[PDB]
Design a protein around this ligand. Structure first.
Ligand SMILES: C/C(=C\C(=O)OCCCCCCCCC(=O)O)C[C@@H]1OC[C@H](C[C@@H]2O[C@H]2[C@@H](C)[C@H](C)O)[C@@H](O)[C@H]1O
Ligand SMILES: [Zn+2]
Length: 918
């Protein structure tokens, strides 16, 4: 009957987020009003923070991994902004390379067409990247992320292409860029060399054969046996044509069987059990005595030299290794060590060429045949020399963009050398491997385990092949002097080319003549120079972003080294490594101080998302289903260092966390909305319960901040949520509802409660603003009191506030100790539950309690236990060692529902006064 006489305590801040409607309006506003530039221009910026963006490929729409990545970057950046620092965060895009060029190739072929003109082909590639750079930029902004998205970096900008080339120039001037001729990864489907980061290892079925190479007559006479054939094991019959040698383990015993097969003795038992060779050994020979004997290749009748390899393994195979220098790296060095032929008759498309006829290595019927299609017919040609064929499965290197298996071909390519000493900037002498290992020890990794992942790769990596045979990318734009057959690294030549690139882009490398590309002083000798037309590994491009973005803009986009880079843990094999290596040539240090990694988006069963599996969840679908602030809370509230599973159950839990945060903020705003703002300019007398809350607010704030400092948003959101749920909602807001709703608006106890709620809302806003930025922006939009209190027009004016100073607290005020009264509260609530089960009582306000520890504040007990009366009464309900509960000897007040009225249906003394209010 008196509900209309209570304090309204409502706010326009709504319970329902309606995120699908309101978030795009918030983000459109931040773009229109240039919130990021306003963040950078903030007048009281103190300190600097550079996060250097790793560039996604400008191909396709964003997937959930991009969203994960940019949200985490956004939280880290916003944290530093709200700490008061000046922010540098320029997002960028990877525009070159097969990731763009392959999509153009697949379209041309689907359209049944070709495009041979180099300038036009690069134009199609460039326009494709421009289209999807726009698409990804606006998709990034729909996640609520703030960065220099209107002035991002692009590896396709002419200045950027000049920067990438100038980095290459520094490598070449330091003596680390050299030509090598050796077998390397060859992708026949795109007719290009590859390096490790462009290769994906996948299980693949393969023939597996054991082949007998008979010793030649004179070798049998030297060995003093009638029959002997070395048995090799190989999974690549397509390289048998290129055999020049059979490599044995140094100083090892080889067993000759009765049928005349020669194998490593340590492997004879296994081989006989496989049925490869017979079981009876007749003679044992040391491999040192077999070296320089000669066998015969059964496929083509050619000589094969018996050699000793370095580190021949005896765990698989036969202990005798078919050695093909044109198709294996260790084979190649063995062939050179013995001055043997390098047979390599497989062309760029992976097919046998005329060289099989010229040297008589393989029958003419194989001309033009792809090496992988030829293998079945090769195996049949082996006849009786084939001792056993099996089919096995092994992890095999595949091209990262055509998805086809690679092969190896001896070829001349350009490398960054790992174990080549070079002159350091401080004058000393060190290899790149040594510098990179030193540099890693100075980088902070989050998690720490990332260090040894990257360190192990550096310890084991080979020389870095740089040259690729595609068209879309930055050329290795050096001339070869025909008079010397060596590259021209003259500073005048290199910088002249770099300047042309900066002004017109690398197109001119294909269009201009040699004379036109040479300085005026060299054009009389243009006849002696020839362009290198290979382009750079795209991992060199992105490995150069630190130079093109941080250094070449002299701090305007961040410092080099950056404070933080943040990408998936798959970038130890990619961007972390290439940036580390180039940083170490140019600066002899890593171009980052700290690396934070995250895992991958996976499905509900932790499995990888793929179109073949039909388990891909699109970014659009997820945002539309849940809203970006929920997707952002999902990220921060979960162990993002590992894989994150998408499932209804986990998003339901996050929506429940978001609702609790949002409902709590609504209650706070609603219950200080009527507070006279003059309270903000005067101190108050806070109760012990108020002090307990402010002292608690401080304690958990320190813990949320320490957790967020170490990027452990889970630990920090759990602290924050536990405070919201337990101390705030469960204790304080329950004890306070009566005063808030039923006391006079002039009541100073109520005004002191509102000040605590205002300080609490202020801390919630500060700590959630990096994560739920839209929502905290919406909180300030709906609360004039919060905006005045925090002196904030919008979310970007937020600062960490001193509650002690804003509420005028005395410094040496001793903290509350509520342990004794909270144990009583817990024991009373356990006893009250039992009485409620029995039906004796319905709620705590129906009770009186006499506490047996008389040293406790009686009004605090009434407040925390929500009893209507502290002391003795007449009707005993139950008793414990700690207290005795009674029925409260009053009527329920019709206005406040507390059992404090002396007459039935009559307002209590407090309520009567409030109702008389003049
Ligand atoms: C979290 C990741 C993947 C994921 O989890 O993605 C899974 C997305 C879910 C659905 C899959 C989409 C289609 C599935 C299918 O059909 O196959 C890994 C991270 O990604 C973002 C960033 C990509 C930038 O380019 C990298 C730069 C730095 C370097 C120079 O290249 C980077 O941070 C990366 O490390
Ligand atoms: Zn009352």
């Amino acid at each position: 009957e008196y509900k209309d006489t209570l304090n309204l305590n409502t706010t326009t801040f709504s319970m329902k987020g309606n995120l699908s409607v309101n978030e795009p309006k918030t983000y459109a506003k931040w773009q229109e009003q240039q919130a990021f530039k306003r963040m950078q221009a903030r007048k009281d910026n103190h300190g600097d923070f550079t996060l250097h963006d790793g560039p996604p490929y400008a191909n396709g729409h964003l997937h959930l991994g991009h969203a994960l990545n940019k949200i985490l970057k956004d939280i880290v950046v916003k944290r530093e902004y709200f700490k008061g620092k000046k922010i540098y965060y320029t997002p960028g895009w990877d525009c070159h390379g097969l990731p763009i060029e392959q999509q153009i190739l697949e379209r041309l072929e689907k359209e049944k067409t070709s495009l041979e003109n180099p300038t036009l082909f690069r134009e199609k590639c460039r326009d494709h990247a421009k289209k999807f750079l726009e698409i990804q930029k606006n998709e990034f902004l729909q996640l609520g992320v703030l960065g220099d998205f209107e002035d991002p970096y692009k590896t396709m900008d002419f200045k950027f292409e000049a920067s990438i080339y100038r980095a290459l120039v520094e490598v070449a001037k330091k003596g680390l860029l050299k030509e090598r001729h050796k077998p390397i990864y060859w992708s026949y489907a795109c007719e290009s060399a590859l390096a490790e980061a462009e290769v994906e290892y996948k299980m693949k079925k393969s023939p597996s054969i054991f082949v007998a190479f008979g010793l030649k007559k004179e070798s049998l006479e030297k060995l003093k046996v009638k029959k002997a054939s070395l048995v090799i094991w190989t999974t690549t019959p397509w390289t048998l044509y290129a055999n020049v040698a059979i490599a044995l383990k140094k100083d090892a015993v080889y067993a000759l069987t009765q049928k005349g097969y020669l194998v490593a003795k340590a492997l004879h038992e296994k081989l006989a059990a496989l049925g490869v060779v017979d079981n009876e050994i007749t003679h044992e020979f040391n491999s040192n005595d077999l070296e320089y004997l000669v066998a015969t290749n059964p496929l083509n009748q050619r000589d094969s030299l018996v050699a000793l390899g370095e580190h021949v393994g005896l765990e698989d195979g036969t202990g005798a290794v078919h050695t093909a220098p044109g198709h294996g790296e260790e084979d190649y060095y063995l062939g050179l060590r013995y001055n043997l032929e390098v047979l390599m008759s497989v062309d760029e498309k992976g097919c046998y060429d005329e060289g099989i006829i010229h040297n008589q290595l393989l029958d003419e019927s194989y001309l033009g045949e792809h090496v992988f299609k030829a293998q079945k017919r090769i195996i049949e040609q082996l006849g009786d020399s084939l001792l056993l064929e099996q089919e096995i499965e092994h992890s095999y290197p595949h091209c990262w963009r055509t998805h086809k298996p690679v092969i190896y071909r001896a070829t001349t390519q350009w490398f960054i050398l790992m174990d080549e000493p070079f002159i350091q900037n401080d004058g000393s002498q060190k290899t790149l491997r040594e510098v990179a290992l030193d540099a890693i020890e100075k980088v902070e990794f989050v998690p720490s385990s990332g260090k040894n992942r990257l360190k192990t790769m550096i310890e084991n990596r080979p020389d870095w092949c740089l040259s690729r045979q595609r068209k879309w990318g930055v050329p290795l734009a050096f001339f070869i002097d025909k008079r010397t057959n060596k590259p021209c690294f003259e500073s005048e030549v290199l910088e002249h080319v770099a300047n042309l690139f900066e002004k017109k882009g690398c197109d001119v490398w294909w269009e201009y003549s040699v004379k036109d590309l040479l300085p005026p002083s060299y054009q009389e000798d243009a006849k002696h120079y020839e362009k290198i037309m290979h382009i750079l590994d795209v991992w060199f491009d992105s490995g150069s972003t630190f130079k093109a973005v941080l250094e070449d803009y002299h701090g305007e986009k961040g410092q080099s080294p950056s404070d933080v880079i943040l990408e998936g843990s798959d970038q130890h094999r990619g961007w972390f490594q290439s940036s580390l290596l180039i940083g170490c040539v140019l600066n002899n240090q890593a171009p980052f101080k700290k690396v934070i990694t995250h895992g991958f988006i996976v499905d509900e069963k932790g499995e990888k998302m793929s179109k073949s599996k039909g388990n891909v969840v699109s970014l659009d679908k997820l945002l539309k289903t849940h809203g970006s602030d929920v997707v952002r809370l999902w990220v921060a509230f979960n162990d993002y260092q590992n894989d994150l599973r998408v499932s209804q159950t986990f998003f339901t839990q996050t929506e429940q966390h978001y609702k609790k945060f949002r409902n709590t903020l609504k209650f706070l705003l609603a219950n200080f909305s009527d507070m006279d703002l003059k309270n903000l300019e005067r101190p108050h007398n806070f109760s012990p319960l108020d002090h307990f809350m402010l002292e608690t607010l401080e304690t958990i704030s320190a813990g949320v901040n320490s957790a967020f400092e170490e990027h452990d948003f889970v630990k920090g959101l759990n602290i924050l949520m536990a405070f919201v749920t337990n101390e705030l909602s469960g204790i304080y807001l329950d004890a306070c509802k009566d005063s808030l709703y039923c006391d006079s608006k002039n009541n100073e106890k109520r005004q002191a409660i509102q000040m605590v709620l205002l300080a609490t809302a202020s801390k919630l806003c500060y700590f959630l603003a990096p994560i739920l930025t839209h929502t905290i922006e919406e909180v300030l939009e709906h609360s004039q009191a919060l905006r005045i209190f925090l002196q904030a027009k919008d979310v970007f004016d937020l600062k960490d506030i001193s509650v002690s100073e804003k509420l005028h607290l005395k410094e040496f005020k001793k903290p509350e100790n509520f342990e004794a009264v909270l144990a009583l509260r817990s024991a009373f609530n356990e006893e009250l539950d039992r009485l409620k089960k029995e039906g004796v009582i319905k709620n705590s306000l129906e009770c009186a309690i006499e506490v047996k520890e008389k040293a406790l504040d009686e009004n605090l007990v009434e407040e925390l236990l929500m009893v209507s009366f502290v002391g003795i009464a007449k009707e005993k309900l139950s008793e414990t060692p700690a207290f005795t509960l009674f029925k409260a000897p009053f009527y329920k007040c019709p206005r406040c529902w507390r059992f404090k009225s002396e007459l039935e249906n009559t307002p209590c003394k407090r309520c009567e006064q409030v109702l008389k209010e003049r």
